[PDB]
């Protein structure tokens, strides 16, 4: 097509620039640094009380409270030190697929197959957890939501579009388009000005917040993008594919940097998270257990088994003290 | 080693017993995933008694039925089908009228794709058949050869229904774990609900036996 021929040339020089700017690979650069060695992680607490499968969880800001969502229809705010239950929120549609806990510790939000994102108060005059406002306007299933402030949130749904909301009014302040199908994951930068999201077409994109227009795209996968993370520094991120290939991309270099694949693993990653320093790249595999990878050496450094079913969510506290994984086993575990 | 944390422990133990009661109240209910390809076929079977998932619940013979309709969601099927892992049965309604109007070939796939899936490996599939009367009138002039070149029997309502029943049942790939209950829908309301209740009762007994291990 002559009309699409210009787009073909555009892709030509962008690929040429990406190829030319790669004067050296990371793997040969990180050769003189000592490996971290084997890592032993043990179960400190085990938390029971969920009955159905667990799909998502989010660590609090103080690294002491966490919230989990399950198909049982209950949203539980655990106390991560004494394994006590703080709140139990009964839901309306028991098809939740994501949850988020406010940076200020005041709000908790979840969404699922009903295409509705609900905001819950936690500190009210009465001793009850009520619904602040239900956000509607998505034609597909809601996949992942992450808070920005107490008045602005960003949501990712299955209708190919990400949106930025406004709890006070409830109307979509900004809408992000450009993906082709089933935007799965979402993660935002520490400075809360840019965020990235993974799509089912195996192509991650970077969206600005104030501008409201896409800034950059990344490709290289083969099947899907089940979950994404974002490097603590803010210039890179790690993305979890569906063919046992975790990838670490880059923002300044605008290229794929390194891959984390093994011959034994054949399943698909379900969740990805980082550590406080950034040396350990944690991933949650479909093969009944989690894993830890060296962000530089790209070699396995420990198998964190102990689950009787696939892990569906993984998170690391703000202070980097513990690691908590949730699985379809319905048992939530916190490791150290 | 607890000054005021005892009250917190009491609260956590009480919102544990409340959750246990709520979860033991949700095991008596039966969850049925409605499916199909034709919106008209769904209607007749959602009519009987009482965006995204549109739930509908009814009570029959002191049994609480929970029926989920999911067809509305216009997205990839493989990204949320596993959320229905524990459904008791999968109601499947297809059209008998549409043998010509390859539309049945379309359904035949949607049945193959749903039946022998990676999930649903131990869930029975109730098979409803709709528009049997219009099928009876329109089968006189339209031979099955247009859509079924392999048909060799006579052109009559009885033989065609049995042949299409056998054709639908042939696509099953796990004959020792599933049970495709087939029924022809009639104008009488009560019969459809009775067939649904009878099929569900049989599945419940088999599920109970699997837990104890009498197999």
């Amino acid at each position, epitope marked *: 097509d002559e009309l699409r021929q210009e787009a073909e040339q555009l892709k030509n020089q962008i690929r040429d620039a990406r190829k030319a700017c790669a004067d050296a690979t990371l793997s040969q650069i990180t050769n003189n640094i000592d490996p971290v060695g084997r890592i032993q992680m043990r179960t400190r607490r085990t938390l029971r009380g969920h009955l159905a499968k667990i799909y998502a969880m989010h660590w609090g800001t103080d690294s002491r409270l966490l919230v989990s969502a399950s198909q049982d229809g209950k949203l539980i705010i655990w106390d991560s030190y004494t394994t006590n239950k703080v709140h139990a929120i009964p839901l309306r549609s028991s098809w939740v697929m994501t949850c988020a806990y406010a940076p200020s*510790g005041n709000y908790v939000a979840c969404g699922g197959l009903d295409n509705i994102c609900s905001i819950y108060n936690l500190k009210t005059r009465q001793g009850n957890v009520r619904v602040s406002r239900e956000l509607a306007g998505h034609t597909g299933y809601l996949s992942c939501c992450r808070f920005l402030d107490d008045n602005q949130i960003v949501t990712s749904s299955g209708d190919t579009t990400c949106a930025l909301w406004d709890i006070e009014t409830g109307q979509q302040t900004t809408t992000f388009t450009g993906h082709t199908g089933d935007v799965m994951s979402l993660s935002l930068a520490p400075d809360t000005r840019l965020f990235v999201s993974g799509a089912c077409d195996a192509s991650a994109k970077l969206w600005d917040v104030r501008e409201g227009m896409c800034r950059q795209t990344f490709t290289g996968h083969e099947s899907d993008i089940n979950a994404i993370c974002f490097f603590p520094d803010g210039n890179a991120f790690a993305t979890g594919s569906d063919d046992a290939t975790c990838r670490l991309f880059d923002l300044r270099a605008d290229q794929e940097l390194m891959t984390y694949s093994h011959d034994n693993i054949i399943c698909g990653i379900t969740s990805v998270s980082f550590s406080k320093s950034g040396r350990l790249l944690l991933a949650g595999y479909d093969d009944f257990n989690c894993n830890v990878w060296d962000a530089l050496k790209a070699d396995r450094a420990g198998v964190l088994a102990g689950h009787d079913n696939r892990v569906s969510c993984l998170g690391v506290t703000d202070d980097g003290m513990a690691v908590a994984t949730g699985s379809w086993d319905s048992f939530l575990k916190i490791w150290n | 080693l607890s000054a*005021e944390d005892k009250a917190a422990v009491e609260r956590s133990k009480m919102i544990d017993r409340n959750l246990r009661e709520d979860g033991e109240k949700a095991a008596r209910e039966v969850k049925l995933l409605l499916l199909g390809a034709g919106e008209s076929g769904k209607s007749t079977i959602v009519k009987q008694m009482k965006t995204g998932i549109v739930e509908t619940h009814f009570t029959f013979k002191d049994l609480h039925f929970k029926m989920f309709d999911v067809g509305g969601q216009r997205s990839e099927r493989k990204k949320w089908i596993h959320c229905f892992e524990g459904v008791t049965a999968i109601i499947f309604c297809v059209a008998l009228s549409d043998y010509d109007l390859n539309r049945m070939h379309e359904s035949m796939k949607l049945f193959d794709s749903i039946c022998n899936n990676k999930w649903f490996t131990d869930t029975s599939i109730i098979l409803f058949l709709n528009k049997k009367d219009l099928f009876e009138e329109k089968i006189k002039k339209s031979p099955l050869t247009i859509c079924y070149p392999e048909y060799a029997g006579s052109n009559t309502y009885e033989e065609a229904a049995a042949y299409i029943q056998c054709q639908f049942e042939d696509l099953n790939k796990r004959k020792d774990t599933k049970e495709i209950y087939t029924h022809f829908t009639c104008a009488t309301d009560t019969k459809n609900v009775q067939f649904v209740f009878d099929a569900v009762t049989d599945v419940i007994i088999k599920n109970n036996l699997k837990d104890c291990g009498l197999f």
Partner: single-chain antibody
Amino acid sequence: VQLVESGGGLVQPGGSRKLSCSASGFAFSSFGMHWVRQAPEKGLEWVAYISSGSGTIYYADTVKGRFTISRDDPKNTLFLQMTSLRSEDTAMYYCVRSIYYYGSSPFDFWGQGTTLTVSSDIVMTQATSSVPVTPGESVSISCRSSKSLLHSNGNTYLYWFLQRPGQSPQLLIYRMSNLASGVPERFSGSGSGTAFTLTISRLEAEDVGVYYCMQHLEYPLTFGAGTKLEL
């Protein structure tokens, strides 16, 4: 968020009486309830405590056995059973709510009061009696405890209370550091070990009142002598 109580009056010594606390406007089926007694022109003193889903009915030692406390969740009403009558038995009775979780703030709301006929435990005490004030500068109030309140958890269980002249008191500082909800930021509490001090940045017209202290490390809850902050 309104506590209404009734049942007070003048009775002959040796009799019995019924006090009922009516709660409307909040989830009363999840708040632990206490009774607080204030002798005329004297300080405060704990009486009883009843938890949510009554399983702990902790009592004061001076009224142990004689008094009986119960609750009725569906009707949202608290009951108190008194028998006999002594000098210490009679005072003004208050109805206080409290909820206990990780980040809760016990002793949020207080009732109105009632009237009757006549006039070891960590003994928190300070009594600086009266402090004359001028609206504007900063005034500090000191308190001393009979035991180290710093539990192994890393937090001290002491509460600060303010009672303006003419109505029920309210909570200002819980765990000697955290501000209550709705109070002005001018208040500031601090201290460690057994030496605690409460400081006010600037004095206003409405700050005049009597300041009390609680310890919550172990029952029974012990009040202080109470310091009046007059002009």
